[PDB]
From a paper:
Next, we determined the structures of PBP3 and SpoVD, at 2.40 Å and 2.20 Å resolution. Both SpoVD and PBP3 possess a canonical class B PBP fold that closely resembles Pseudomonas aeruginosa and E. coli PBP329,30. Like PBP2, the four residues in the Zn2+-binding motif of [name] PBP3 and SpoVD consist of an invariant His, a Cys from the X residue of the SXN motif, and two electron rich residues—in this case Cys instead of Asp. Importantly, we find Zn2+ binds in an almost identical manner as PBP2, suggesting Asp and Cys are interchangeable at the first and second position. The significance of the Asp → Cys substitution between SpoVD/PBP3 and PBP2 is unclear. Whereas the redox-sensitive cysteine in the SXN motif for PBP2 can potentially function as a sensor for environmental oxygen levels, the replacement of Asp for Cys in both sporulation specific [name] (PBP3 and SpoVD) may further enhance the sensitivity and/or subject them to additional regulation. Subsequent biochemical analysis of purified PBP1, PBP2, and PBP3 demonstrate PBP1 and PBP2 are selectively insensitive to most cephalosporins, in contrast to the non-essential PBP3 which is potently inhibited by all β-lactams. Nonetheless, SpoVD and PBP3 are very promising drug targets.
Cephalosporins are members of the β-lactam family of antibiotics. These drugs achieve their bactericidal potency by irreversibly inhibiting penicillin-binding proteins ([name]), particularly the transpeptidase (TPase) [name] that cross-link cell wall peptidoglycan. Four annotated TPase [name] exist in the genome of [name] R20291, a hypervirulent epidemic ribotype 027 strain: PBP1 (CDR20291_0712), PBP2 (CDR20291_0985), PBP3 ([name]), and SpoVD (CDR20291_2544). A recent study found PBP1 and PBP2 are essential for vegetative growth in R20291, while SpoVD and PBP3 are essential for sporogenesis. Remarkably, in addition to [name] PBP2, we find this Zn2+-binding motif is also present in [name] PBP3 and SpoVD, meaning three of the four TPase [name], and all three class B [name] in [name] have this motif.
Residue numbers in the entry: 55 to 197, 216 to 554
Write the structure that this text describes.
């Protein structure tokens, strides 16, 4: 009879060699079933040591009815109680559970089947071929446990501390959210969080749940970009030479859509007035961006989107990434305002923001660094399949400069005062939950303003109870990682 001291799977580590699985030490008390069932001394000895009761014990007994030896999960058995129990034929072993109670990085890590130990989602499934039976710790019963030179573990790009801070923040939001933080200069993913959460230790209780408790909204959920798309129209316009830094537009609060008497109102309604490019972008002025879009056309804007990696998978090492194809036909109006049949995951928006933030040096977003041994020595390097590109660096630097204005005297002025500044673009997605008009809140940008280290993307889903801005959560993130 085999006693499992761990899941047998390769540990998952963060970028700094801190464990993200296999963190909480616990105990497995092992007793012969006949001895337990026929001898009140042994029952009452186990009860004392575990602090369990008869119901807890005989639940365990009933689950292992057929086995000649019974294994009880417990903890905090000191040394006297340990030798004591061994005098009574009861051996106690130090064990490691796969997932803490903390449950950091749930959707990204995923979960395993308990019989099989096989990966069912996230990293556990995408990297099951290298992690399964790569770290086997077990004893044989009716009475090896320690390291082996061929043990393999997976080291990721995640920063445990940044991940913790982000989960603290999204845990205070009742609305479903998606948040990703990546390194501007390398594309390494420092943190990813989706809400609502699931319990990796209780796949049953969550599966009955109704709100996508198992959806990685960062990599799977697509949303309309709203004004976030003005990064692309602004990029497209400056790259195609249709506008320059000297563009002025007079927002009177409305405009005719091309040649028709179809009318697009501004959000100000009484108008922004005379705007330079910085103000048109900062004010998120729909009429100014229709004016800019009309000068480009559908195809130049889509090619610009394609060039910024919005019409392909980011391919970060997780296979369940979903995307939505470029629309067959869409009105230049819906392009300008970023609504209808154009949608992106937060992962894609983050990748696009990485390029702008990094002055056109595209670093493909990725989650894995290496497969390591028990000494944390590199056995092999992992990296993106994607080729590095230098993309319109000058244009990228212009969009990036204008994004520093949005934070200071724009739609996201509440960020004017954060230590070190930031560059952002906010936006609102228009969806439907039931047939009610529901609004999802976007913000994307980089922190700090001057030499960005972080590319940050947040999406707060609307609910029947109402819609929310992403700006507050972006602010808390920046305040918690200064
Ligand atoms: Zn306007």
């Amino acid at each position: 009879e085999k006693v499992e001291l761990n899941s047998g799977r390769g540990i998952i580590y963060d970028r700094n060699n801190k464990k993200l699985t296999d963190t909480s030490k616990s105990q497995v008390l092992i007793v012969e079933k006949e001895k337990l069932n026929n001898n009140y001394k042994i029952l009452e000895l186990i009860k004392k040591a575990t602090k369990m009761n008869d119901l807890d014990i005989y639940k365990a007994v009933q689950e292992q009815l057929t086995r000649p030896i019974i294994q009880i999960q417990t903890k905090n058995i000191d040394k006297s109680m340990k030798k004591e129990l061994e005098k009574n034929g009861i051996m106690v072993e130090e064990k490691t559970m796969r997932y803490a109670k903390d449950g950091l990085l749930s959707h990204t890590i995923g979960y395993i089947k308990e019989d099989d130990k096989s990966g069912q989602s996230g990293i556990e499934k995408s990297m099951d071929s290298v992690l399964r039976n790569s770290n086997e710790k077990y004893i044989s019963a009716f009475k090896t446990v320690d390291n082996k030179d061929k043990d393999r573990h997976l080291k990721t790009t995640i920063d445990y501390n940044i991940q913790k801070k982000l989960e603290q923040i999204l845990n205070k939001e009742e609305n479903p959210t998606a948040a990703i933080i990546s390194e501007a200069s390398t594309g390494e993913i420092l943190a990813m969080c989706s809400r609502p959460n699931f319990d990796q230790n209780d796949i049953s209780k969550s599966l009955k749940g109704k709100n996508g408790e198992f959806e990685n909204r960062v990599i799977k959920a697509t949303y309309p970009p709203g004004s976030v798309f003005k990064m692309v129209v602004l990029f497209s316009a400056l790259e195609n030479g249709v506008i320059d830094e000297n563009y002025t537009y007079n927002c009177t609060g409305k405009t005719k859509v091309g040649n028709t008497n179809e009318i697009l109102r501004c959000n100000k309604r009484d108008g922004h007035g005379f705007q330079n490019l910085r103000q048109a972008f900062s004010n998120s002025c729909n009429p100014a961006f229709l004016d800019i879009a009309m000068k480009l056309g559908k195809e130049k804007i889509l090619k610009s989107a394609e060039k910024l990696h919005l019409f392909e998978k980011v391919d970060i090492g997780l296979d369940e990434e979903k995307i939505r194809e470029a629309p067959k036909n869409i009105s230049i109006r819906n392009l300008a305002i970023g609504q209808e049949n154009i949608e992106f995951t937060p992962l894609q928006i983050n990748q696009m923001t990485q390029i702008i933030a990094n002055n056109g040096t595209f670093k493909p977003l990725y989650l894995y660094k290496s497969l390591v041994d028990n000494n944390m020595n590199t056995i092999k390097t992992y990296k993106s399949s994607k080729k590095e590109e230098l993309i319109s660096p000058y244009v990228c630097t212009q969009v990036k400069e204008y994004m520093k204005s949005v934070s200071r005297i724009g739609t996201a002025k509440d960020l004017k005062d954060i230590e070190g500044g930031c560059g952002v673009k906010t936006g609102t997605a228009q969806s439907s939950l039931n047939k009610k008009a529901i609004d999802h809140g976007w913000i994307t940008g980089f922190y700090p303003e001057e030499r960005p280290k972080y590319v940050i993307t947040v999406l707060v889903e609307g609910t029947q109870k109402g819609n929310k801005s992403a700006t507050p959560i972006f602010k808390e993130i920046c305040e918690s990682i200064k």
